[model samples]
Target: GSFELTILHTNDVHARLEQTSRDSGKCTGEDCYGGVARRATKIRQIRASHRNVLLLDAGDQYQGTIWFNYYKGREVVHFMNSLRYDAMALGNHEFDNGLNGLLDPLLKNVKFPILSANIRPKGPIASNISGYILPYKIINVGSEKVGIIGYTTKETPVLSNPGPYLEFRDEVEELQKHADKLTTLGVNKIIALGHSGFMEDCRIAQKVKGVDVVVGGHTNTFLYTGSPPSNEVAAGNYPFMQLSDDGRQVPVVQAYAFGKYLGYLNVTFDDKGKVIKASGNPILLNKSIQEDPAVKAEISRMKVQLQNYSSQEIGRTIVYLNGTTHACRFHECNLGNLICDAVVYNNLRHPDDNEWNHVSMCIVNGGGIRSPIDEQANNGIITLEELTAVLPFGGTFDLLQIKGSTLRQAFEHSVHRHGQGTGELLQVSGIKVVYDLSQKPGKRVVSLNVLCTECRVPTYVPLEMEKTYKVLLPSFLAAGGDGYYMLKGDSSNHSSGDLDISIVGDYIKRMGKVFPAMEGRMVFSAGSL
Candidate 1:
């Protein structure tokens, strides 16, 4: 006898609670593609037809829109609970507001278990929220027992603010442990649920035993079976099959970010709990999928409060500020250039009466930039909501003193995992770096030039190894986020007290019509040095 299970999942919703445009921005009428209302309708329709259905989210339900910034994850949690999600994995952005912001109120409110096998709660306060967080949950789907194990990215410490109370372990090791434990409990047909990206998910499938399926997030990967229904190009086949350690075939799936698609996978499992068949694709929530009336009503109520303030015009932009994950994470983007320029412009306008005042260079992790300023949406009129969406984490600038050599080390890391869409990619101002992608990561940086801060006329010069340069960068990086360990110890003695959003907001206001260009701050060479 075989048991069939239907799995409906979403990952990296990123608080786009309202209907989104083609680019996942605000829209109405024909332009609107997805919203929680539409998603709820699709999920409900599926649950009605399938007897053994599991609705899951692969994490990152926070940090993308003005809704997240205003609600601090409160609104999205309500929607998840309303939809009755079976289980969820912990995404890196869940820690953006730290434990207190996510755990104290939100964890207790969640109706479903937030699973993370690799996360160990430390300190006295951890005990408070530990009950809601589980390594794996044995869920009853019809007569069969389905074991779902969870794991988050191991790079959480450097990616967001998990604080001292959480210790993230290796994904493969922790997942293997939990899968075995579940097996010992007489539970089979296990699924590995995690937020460690597509590459790491496949690795877990290959390394771990007893796991029949892998569902993942954090990369916002668009996996489809055939030609995608929407504009998103498929990263790989939906339910990408992988050979496991025990010689079992495991299937993996992930929906694209911002509630654009709902992933649906049906798996037929043998009595031994090995998956024999897997098929399905992500259902696009286009206009054809009607929004549920009740969900739409609630969303409309919430929009009133946000619409009043978020729509307030701040300034104007002549060009599209590209901050999409693909654009920013992989290479230099105009949005990256604009935000970095805003920092430099803000500092120059209000110079401190100290050594920090002379700081010339600025660096921001491309991952920190969340959304793009779409010129088409509001007719080039930038709004407060648009700015907040770009930098929703409320990151601040901190001036630090660092050796030129250390800066180069940081630059090397910016491109270390090139082409993989890693978040460590840096967007800069006041310095130019040429990289040879043909070379290995550490040796990728071929040339570096820094703008002289103390010179009579600011001019570019080769970086001196011994010379210490005063630089301005996000506090997240100065604290060693995104594996930029070289910048960790360099103390941030000069705190700008300027939030990222405000700095950019002020810059836009002052310029009236801002068009920040990419002036070859980062040049990629084809051949070896």
Candidate 2:
């Protein structure tokens, strides 16, 4: 008798529970992609027919929407438990709130195992939790033993840091060792759940021998679907699956982040548990799919429970925040200015009590601003929803102490990584820098100046190697989330308080009714021959 196994998976949910609009201007319909309640209903329906089914997620669960910031990921845990997810891999964003945020909910509430082969906690975290990263797991499905291992990308240095106590290593090497161990244990069928992007996944598929299936995340690739053109590859092919080094091709799948699609892979294995034939595609999680009445009622009840806080008017808006290209692409815009100014404003008011408050300037990475500001100039309407899209990750203000030399070094480093066409340039509020792209690499930044309310003119400060100046920036930058390695090297005086994103709205409220414009803080002039 032959048996069939179906694997359902999703990646990079980023805390999007409700139906939302796409960042890029594409189609206007109820996002037919990912809602936990609807996914639960779909899982139930699938289980009724298929005897063996495994549900999985590929990380990036926390720190995307207002729900995550308000509830601190508890709501997501409740939803995942209800769906009965078999296993999951930790994405880079999992560490956005640090180790406590990553472990608190999972250790206290989540019932399933969180799998990752690379992550390792230091000190108490290591001794207390023995299995933060599971090398491999063995599960029985219809008289067959299926061994699965999980791995995450080694880009943690640029993604996030779980304090000095945590560390990540090379995925390919670690996974090879685990695959060898599983083979010794007589497991013929092996699968790898990875947070590595598509390029790394393909690398692993080619080098690793025992892995029969690989599920990936971190790039938010929409596999086997044609909805988002950015995710669609050449010839309208799904960017999943590849043959292993030993000629044993594994079925790879990933559901695009934010609940856009549910990835399904059906595999038929021979008696030896080797995958013989496999076919998979993305299932749209649209409103057209009938919602379970009971689940719908439960969701309605939860919304009512949260009505007071959710409905409160935090601030007024003069524009709608859309994720369109024409509005905030390749040039300075009012929304970028607003967000950069917000960082400077909040950090100034809430200086770290323990650290020196002599902040010279503030900076924000443009990539952090996920959504575009709405330009419906006629009606002065700004909703909480619009604000959420603008600052989706909700990073808090942080302080870094670096000398003028180090600050210049940081700018030079940014140029190395960001170049002319790079989108990772530093958006600032209290400093001025002139850079010419036509000049040589190190000479891009022509002039560097600092500004404070007390100072009449932006002063041209010399790079003093010994003297250190306090600089304010987002927590993401302080912790080396972006490629700002200079900040990581300098001494930091992090505040001992939670930084909230709503502070951006509050700052706007304080500066009520002002026409926003670029402050000429980070001007870029075209290079001349």
Candidate 3:
């Protein structure tokens, strides 16, 4: 006998309590996408039609928007509790506010178990949260037990503030341990609920035994087989099939972020717990779908608290800030420029004061720009809330020195997969780079110019590979997040500065009318010149 089960899923919602607008990388107004209110209707409609469904979130419920900034994930609890999630994985950003901020309070309110297998957090934060976090969970679907094992990214240390108490273990080993435990207990059907991103999801399916399915987050990958809606391209084939160590096929899936799409995976499992059938695609929740009135009312109440702050005018811009994931990860963006320049500008405040005379460049990862600066909102005036979303982590600035040869390597590393769009793409300041896309990826940088900070004329010069230069960077990158290990150098030769948001805010105010335009710092052309 075989049984069918439907899994309703979302990942990387990132505190999008309200609908995203056109300028914010989604549709605007009534036609807008993503809100806990809209998601409630979509969830109800799905449940009304399907008999056996499990609603799950793959984590990153913190950061990105003002709701998270104000409520510190308590608002997420209110909304998610309303939707009634079955299970969730612990994402890196869940720790954005540290364990004291999100862990204790979030654990107090949620009705579901927050899962992560490898971590053994054992101090004050864990004392309150241990009961909430689980290695694996079993749910009964009409007399059959389905096991879900949780795993978070090991990269949480460098990416977010996991604090001292939390410890991360190897993913494969930890997952295999839990899955085998569940199997020994006779719960044969297993799902890997992970916040380790799309690639790691596939790897989990391939490497771990008894994990029949993987639901994931962190990378915000949109995988689908059917036509993608809203003019967006699907990242890869849905239910991506991966072969296990002994040759069993396991399926993987991840819905795009911001609650814009609800992933639906319908699976039929045989008596032996082997998957007999698997088919489904993500449901694009558009504006035509009505918002649950109660949820809408709750969201409205939440918004009242944040309205004044979000509406506060900081600065004006004419061009749209291209900080959307698709834009920032693929090219040079105005928002990226603003952030990078802020780093350079703040460090330069010290002047010939000894530590920063050589500092002339900075490289910011596309991932740092969590959301695009909306141009239509408040007539293009920037807001603290918008700035918070752009640099949510608000980590301090750090200084380092990399040789010109290493600098070229850093830029080369930034653009390895140009068109596909990756977080590693560099948002730069104080340099000119001519990338020859006509050539192969690693060999793309045909020419480079470094801003001569000490030059009397104060202009650009061809980078001399032998000469070393200073660079300003986010503490996250300086600590080697996003593989910028090349940027970490000189044990004694670095100065850590102020919070990133403060620097960007200062720069925006100093600039007055922002030129939200591309600075021609990064150019794409054939190597003809």
Candidate topping TM-score: 1
Candidate 2 collision pairs: 32-285, 32-286, 33-259, 33-260, 33-285, 34-259, 317-382, 320-374, 321-374
lDDT score at residue 317, model 3, on the 0-100 scale: 75
lDDT of predicted model 2: 0.66
TM-score of structure candidate 1: 0.67
Under the 3 Å rule for N, CA and C atoms, how many clashes does model 1 have?
A: 0
The RMSD of every model to the true structure, in order and in angstroms, is 11.6, 10.1, 10.8
TM-score per candidate: 0.67, 0.66, 0.67
Residue range 1-529, candidate 2, lDDT tens digits: 5557898888877776655554421225755445676677788888889888988888877756566656677877887888888888887767655677777775457877777887666678753553555767887876787877888776543345455566687888888988899899999887788788776777777788887788888766666534553344432235355877788767767766677677788888776767787786767666666666666676667667656545555555554543333334344556666665665555442122333224547766666667765556435444456566666654556666677787887776555544344445666666777767666666677777765433434454544557666667666777676667667633123431124355576576676653566657666786542
**lDDT score, candidate 2, position 303:** 60
Error of 3 at 251 (Å): 1.2
What ranges in model 1 sit over 4 Å off? Answer: 308-529
lDDT of 3 by residue, 1-529 (tens): 8888899998988777777753234344557777888889989998899888899899888766556656878888888888999998888878765677665568778888889998886686565666578899998876789899999988675455566567889889999999889999999899999898777898899999899999998877788897777755787888888888868778899988877888999998999889888889988877788888999998788778877756667677777888899878877788888888877776553224233344678878887789987777767788787887887664667677678898888888777777766588888888888887767778988789978876644578999898888777777777777777777744344434445775677688788768756878788884432
Query: What TM-score does structure 3 among the candidates reach?
Result: 0.67
Q: Give the alpha-carbon lDDT of every model.
A: 0.83, 0.66, 0.79
**What would the per-residue lDDT of candidate 1 be over residues 1-529, giving only the tens digit for each residue?**
9999999999988788998888787684476877899999999999999888999989888776668766878886889999989999888878767788878556878888889999888876765666678999999999989999999987665445676568899999999898899999999889899898888999999999888899988777889888888789988888888888778778988998889999999999989998889999999998899999999999999989777657777789888888999888887889998888888775552122332236678998998998888888878898787887898775567667788899999989999898888788999988999998888879999999988876656788999889998777887887789898787743123332245776787688788998877778999985633
